[PDB]
Structure formats: C-alpha cells, structure tokens
Amino acid sequence: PEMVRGQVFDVGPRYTNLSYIGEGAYGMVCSAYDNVNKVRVAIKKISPFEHQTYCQRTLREIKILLRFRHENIIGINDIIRAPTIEQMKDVYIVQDLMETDLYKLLKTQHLSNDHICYFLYQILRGLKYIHSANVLHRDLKPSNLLLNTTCDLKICDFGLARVADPDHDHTGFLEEYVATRWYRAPEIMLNSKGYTKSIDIWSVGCILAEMLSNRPIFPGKHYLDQLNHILGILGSPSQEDLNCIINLKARNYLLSLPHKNKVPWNRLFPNADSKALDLLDKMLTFNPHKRIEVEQALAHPYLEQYYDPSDEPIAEAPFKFDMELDDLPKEKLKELIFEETARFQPG
C-alpha cells in the first residue's frame, strides 16, 4: 500500500508518485499522477468514520460537491473507497490540482485593484450558483478559495454547507470544526437560528477587505473579542440593527457595551478604489436584511467589466429536494457515503 509520511494512502494502481502537499481539514492532502488522464491531481484522504459529526462533514462535502457543475467550484473527479461497506474505513477524494489558495497568495503578494476585481467577481459568480441551489457555504475564507496563476478561482470545501433554512436551530457543529470567527456574520454569532444566504455575503465582504489591505478586517481572538472587533469598525448598532437580534440576552449584552463610532471606510483603506468600498459597505452591513444579496453584488458598478448575466449560470439540481435533515445515526451516514461514492467503482 503506497504510503506518504508514515500514513496509509491506498490510491490504487491508477494514482501513483505521491507527494505530500499539506495537512487539511479532513486529513492528509497529496498530489498524485493520474495514469489515465496523464496529469497530476490532488487527493484528499478522509478517514475515521467513528464520529457522527465527521461523517456528516463528509457526506455534505461529497453530496454537494458531487451535484455541482460550475467553473468557480472545485469538482470531484474520482472517489476511491473499499468495495464493501464493512471494509470502508476511509475515503479518498480526487480533485483538480490547484497551484495555490487566496490565503497563501495574500500571505505573499499585495494585489493590484485589477486582480482583486476579477477574483471578487469569480467568488460572487460561483456564489450566485451556490445560492441558487438553495445552499449555504458557511465557511467562505481565503484558504477555501483555490487559484492557479491563470487567475482561475475555485470555491472549495462544502463540509459545513447546509440547505438554506432560517428555521434551523444552531447546534455548534459550525464551531466544532471552525474555531476562527474572522469571517463569521454577526448574526451567526449571536442568534441561534434564522441564518440566511446573507451570512455568505458577509464572509465575502470580509474576504474583500482582506484583499485590499492583506490584513484581516475582524481578527478577534475569542468570542466576545470578535464582537468587539466588529462594533469597533462598524460603530455601535442602530435602533433597528438591534432588532435583527432574536436572542434578548445577546441584544442586552451589545447594549451594555460602551458606544463605538463608525470608522469611515476610506479612512481604513486610504488608497482603495471608491467603487470597491461602496460595494464593501453593503457587504459588511450588520443588519442581514439590509445587507446586499449576491445577484445584486454582481450587478455593482465595481464589477462593471465582468458582469454578464448570461454567463452566470444558476443551479439545475437545487436542494429543494432534501431539506437534508442530517443529525441522525452515524452508521446510517456511513451508508449514505457508501451510496454517494458508488458511481466511481469498477461498475
């Protein structure tokens, strides 16, 4: 069994010459030579199916990624797993090998306005599709946006994605796998339900601000600190801003905090494009109902030169089918994983 860095990486006779890329959210990531397509691919190993929420994380990542066909979303090219369900202790996902991600990129380059614009467009172009499928990503961040030097962007990792349902009660599955909350919408952070598509717009807003200045906008270290960071820039919430908060014990907490003034965007991003900030201001609106929606963002004057509604495709297989209702026996999820992955076996 071909193995990388002391770990078993059984990627069959098809995928050979493995190279350790890095440690990911599911486990080890490798590059491999695909002997059928004559190219190097990326392979993610996803292992122990002994924890329920991890099986959840895996099914979402598979099911969603496997029924999406979009230029700006990474696709699954192959899945390797044991022929029998009892033997399936791990699952290998095979994707397009991408040169870098936006986290690594902002870590090295300072981006030109032109580059930012195109990247933002692609994020939103890919998002319009995600949303039209009735899907919430919930984990939009630089490290989840894969590039290669041609400037092609692909949104990745749908393990935390849920079907858009404001009536869904929050379970902490979100914070079980993502502790950093720099890109978390304020209402996610203090409500417990009512999360809408606009949580994803907020994240993109955070990603935009981070492309303009390379520093993250709200880099809070802890829970209460993250809230403080948001009000530190956005200013203390307005009369009706507060009305977005269903959790009265949270609403009172925000009110108990000392007054903070709004920091004008041009004072925070001295030499950023004026069209870029007007868009940002709408993406980083505390009030999730006032906050700009994806389709409207693409139509913003800042993306003037890329906006083409005929080349911005919507989902054909939307998650109306499946409210999805996971959070059930783990042995059943493993079966659903075995099922979803079955269309890649010798048959």
């Binding site: 032109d114 580059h115 195109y118 030097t149 041609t150 902490g172 417990s192 949270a250 009172n252």
Partner: protein, 86 residues
Amino acid sequence: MAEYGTLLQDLTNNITLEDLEQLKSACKEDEEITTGSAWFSFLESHNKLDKDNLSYIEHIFEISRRPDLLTMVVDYRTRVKLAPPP
C-alpha cells in the same frame, strides 16, 4: 476556592429552567433529568468543571449564545507570478 462558588451561584441565578434546556442541548454527545445547579455538579463530577477548569462552560456559553454568562466567567477568571485578468 470559595470565590469560584460565589460565581457558580451568579451563573445559577441567571439560568432559568428554559435556558437550562438550551444549555444541555449544547452539551449534545456528552441522561436528561437535571435542573439548574444539578448541571454544574454533573459537569464537576465528570471532570468538566473546576476552580481552574473553565474550558467547557466557556465553550457551552458560546454555543448557547450566552455572552452574559460567559462574561461572568471571563471576569472572575481574570480576577482569580500572476497573469493579467481579461
């Protein structure tokens, strides 16, 4: 030692029977029959709560979206090569 008890009470005075339900749901994978201060002494006797072990309640107060609770824990822990686009 005894000041941890002072702000165990502070937390118990701020957990209504209904908040208690939202708090035990947040302790998902980790028996139903508990009521208020019985929750703390359950956590304590399962090594999830000490004078020095606050990790878990700090976490549960976040998942339950209770900054008012967590703020009391914090406060009495501080005392104690790119190609051009088209």
